[PDB]
Structure formats: structure tokens, C-alpha cells
């Protein structure tokens, strides 16, 4: 799958297995002993069994089935909801430690910024991808971590960070709405649909209210527009294009995250905004949308940054905590 070459510390002679257990996804970071390979894997949390089965498989294939030489470090919120369930599922384990979620995210991000080349990049449709040589000025920054929800962290110094804000309108909202509305079963089908979509069929644009014309005034604002009469089936029967709905709600959720990230950056006098989590997925349209929102509100005085291992910030911090 996804690997980085990095000279890990194997002084403890231990197979370190870091797990970020979110509401919806589990992310693992691990290194076969003496491999000098960081390995990354993502699965869904619902069906907690099918995941615990993943942790067994990693231990079987990558540490010769040796539980006694395996240490699990649990991060995210399942780290508490599931600390005991892990001991119950892995009785011969050498140990299970925890690493607080926000501290995991920042240690992971600081590691990727300072240590790993070709990891930090800008993206817009104009310029395309520019790699930022951060591992070759950095502080202060915001991390906007987009998962089910949105966590926003302020980082002033290497070990000084706080959670300044958040939103319940994250990836979970986008995935949930588009799944229920369109029947799409994969985030990739939602993304492929959004790519060919025209949001103008479901959104009220500035031009639609008045007569920038393509600016959205109201996301999904065009949609709403005893028995004695005909059945109100003309309403129930009104139809909307799946690609158009996907583009509308991708813009709505992405622009909103962008605006909140810009406002928090404004309050905190921060120029550098990192997007983390499992939301952009390297999708050019999502990245362009988040980059443009930061560019638009700041008139280019602030910068959106993306991460090749955006999903693995927490697990990476947790892995490094093992020593």
C-alpha cells in the first residue's frame, strides 16, 4: 500500500502499531522491526470486528504473528471507547498505550512538515501542484482536521497547541447527505459525480437573485421552489441530477469549512492553514475549493496547504510516542 522510507528507532526491539480510531475510519501507522519503512492503512470502524481482524492480519503478516513483541498505541476517540476492548481482543500483546487525539495530530503534522520530503503541497486549478520544501516561517499555523466533523487546532510553537474551534459540518455530513439523496455507495462515486456536476440547477447564484455571477447565494436554494384534491405527487415527483447535487453539497461543505478556517486564521493572526483528515483524498476539485476559499477571503494573504498523508496525522503522532 502507501509506504515512506524513514530510519525509525527500533532500540526497543518492538513492533509499534499505531491506531487512530475515529467515529467512522480507523487509520494505522506501523514499521516492521528494522525495515526503515513507515506503512499506512485505512479501514471503516463500524463492524469493529472486521477492524480488530485487520490488526490481527498486520501482526500475522508484518511481525511474524508475534503479539509478545507488538505494542499497540491507540489515538482518536475510540482510544477510550475501545482501550479495554483492545486488551480483550489482544491478550498476549506486549502492551497498549494511549496518545491524546489533538497531541497526536500535531506531533504527526510536525513530523511530516520537518522530516518527510514531497509531503506538504499547495494545489489550485490555475498553478496545479507545488511541493513546499518544509523538510529542507512554519509557525504559527492552523490545522483544520476534516473527518466526520471538523477540529481546528492553533500551533504557535513546536509543543504549544490548543483546539480553537470546530464544526459538526464535516466529511460525515457530506457523505451522509449525498448517500441518502443519491444512493451513491462510495465517496469516489460522489466525487466522480460532483466532477461533472453543474450546481447551478440546485443552487441560487448571485445572478439568479439579481441579474461574480457564478457566486453561490444559497446552496440547494432552488430545490424547495381530509383528501379532496389531486395527490401532491407533482412535488414528490420533482427530479434533480445526482452530479449537480454532488457538486452543490461538495461546494457547500467545502466553502463553509474554508470560511470558518479563514475566520479562525483572522482571529489568531495566522497565515498558514493545513488541511488534514480523510476529506480531500487528493481530489483536485475539493483541494481547489478549499484553496480558493482561503485565497478569496484573504485576497491571497493566507495560504491553504495539503498533506500526502493527511489521514495519518494522528496515527503518526501516536507511533512516534512509542519512542
Ligand X SMILES: CC(C)(C)c1ccc(CNc2nc3[nH]c(CN4CCOCC4)cc(=O)n3n2)cc1
Residues in contact with ligand X by CB under 6 A are: 77, 101, 149-151, 165-168, 206, 209-210, 215, 217
- Which residues between 21 and 40 bind its own copies (CB under 8 A)? 22-24
**By the rule CB under 8 A, 232 interacts with its own copies:** yes
Q: How far is the CB of 248 from its own copies (least distance, A)?
A: 9
Grid cell for residue 63: 511481525
CB-nearer residue toward its own copies: 89 or 173: 173
- Rounded CA separation 186/12 (Å): 40
Angle between helices 242-267 and 187-196 (to 10 degrees): 100
User: Stretches 1-9, 12-20, 71-79, 119-127: which one binds its own copies (CB under 8 A)?
Assistant: 71-79
Binding mask 114-153 for its own copies (x = CB under 8 A): ---------------------------------xxx----
Q: Is residue 132 within 8 Å of 116, Cβ to Cβ?
A: no
Q: CA geometry: angle at 5 spanning 312 and 159, to 5°? A: 50
CB-nearer residue toward ligand X: 66 or 215: 215
CB-nearer residue toward its own copies: 138 or 267: 267
CB-nearer residue toward ligand X: 101 or 244: 101
Selected from 37, 56, 98, 163, the binder of its own copies by CB under 8 A is 163
Q: How far is the CB of 62 from its own copies (least distance, A)?
A: 28
Strand pairing report for 120-124 and 128-131: antiparallel
For residue 313, give the 3-state DSSP assignment: helix
The string over 158-174, giving b where at least 16 C-beta atoms fall within 10 Å of a residue's C-beta and e elsewhere, is eeebeeebbbebbbbbb
In which order are the strands placed within the sheet that holds 150-157? 128-131, 120-124, 303-307, 272-277, 141-146, 150-157, 160-167
Q: How far is the CB of 277 from ligand X (least distance, A)?
A: 10
Amino acid at each position: 500500500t502507501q509506504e515512506i522510507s524513514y530510519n525509525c528507532d527500533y532500540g526497543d526491539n518492538t513492533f509499534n502499531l499505531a491506531i487512530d480510531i475515529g467515529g467512522t475510519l480507523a487509520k494505522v501507522v506501523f514499521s516492521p522491526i528494522h525495515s526503515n519503512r513507515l506503512m499506512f492503512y485505512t479501514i471503516e470502524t463500524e463492524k469493529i470486528d472486521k477492524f480488530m481482524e485487520l490488526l490481527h492480519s498486520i501482526i500475522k503478516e508484518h511481525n511474524n504473528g508475534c503479539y509478545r513483541m507488538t505494542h499497540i498505541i491507540a489515538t482518536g476517540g475510540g482510544a477510550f471507547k475501545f482501550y479495554d476492548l483492545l486488551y480483550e481482543n489482544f491478550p498476549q500483546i506486549k502492551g497498549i498505550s494511549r496518545f491524546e487525539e489533538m497531541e497526536g495530530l500535531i506531533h504527526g503534522l510536525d513530523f511530516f512538515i520537518h522530516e518527510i520530503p514531497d509531503e506538504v503541497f499547495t494545489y489550485n486549478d490555475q498553478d496545479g501542484e507545488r511541493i513546499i520544501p518544509t523538510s529542507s516561517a512554519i509557525y504559527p499555523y492552523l490545522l483544520v482536521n476534516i473527518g466526520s466533523g471538523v477540529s481546528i487546532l492553533k500551533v504557535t510553537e513546536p509543543n504549544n497547541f490548543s483546539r480553537v474551534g470546530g464544526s459538526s459540518l464535516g466529511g460525515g455530513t457530506l457523505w451522509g447527505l449525498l448517500s441518502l439523496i443519491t444512493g451513491a455507495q462510495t465517496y469516489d462515486q460522489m466525487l466522480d459525480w460532483a466532477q461533472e456536476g453543474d450546481n447551478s440547477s440546485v443552487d441560487m447564484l448571485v445572478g439568479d437573485i439579481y441579474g461574480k455571477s457564478s457566486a453561490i447565494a444559497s446552496s440547494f436554494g432552488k430545490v424547495f421552489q381530509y383528501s379532496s384534491h389531486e395527490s401532491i405527487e407533482k412535488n414528490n415527483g420533482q427530479m434533480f441530477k445526482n452530479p449537480d447535487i454532488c457538486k452543490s453539497l461538495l461546494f457547500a461543505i467545502s466553502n463553509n469549512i474554508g470560511q470558518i478556517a479563514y475566520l479562525q486564521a483572522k482571529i489568531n493572526n495566522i497565515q498558514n492553514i493545513y488541511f488534514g483528515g480523510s476529506y480531500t483524498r487528493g481530489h483536485l476539485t475539493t483541494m481547489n475549493t478549499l484553496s480558493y476559499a482561503i485565497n478569496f477571503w484573504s485576497q491571497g494573504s493566507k495560504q491553504a496547504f495539503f498533506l500526502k498523508h493527511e489521514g495519518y496525522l494522528g496515527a503518526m503522532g501516536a507511533f512516534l510516542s512509542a519512542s
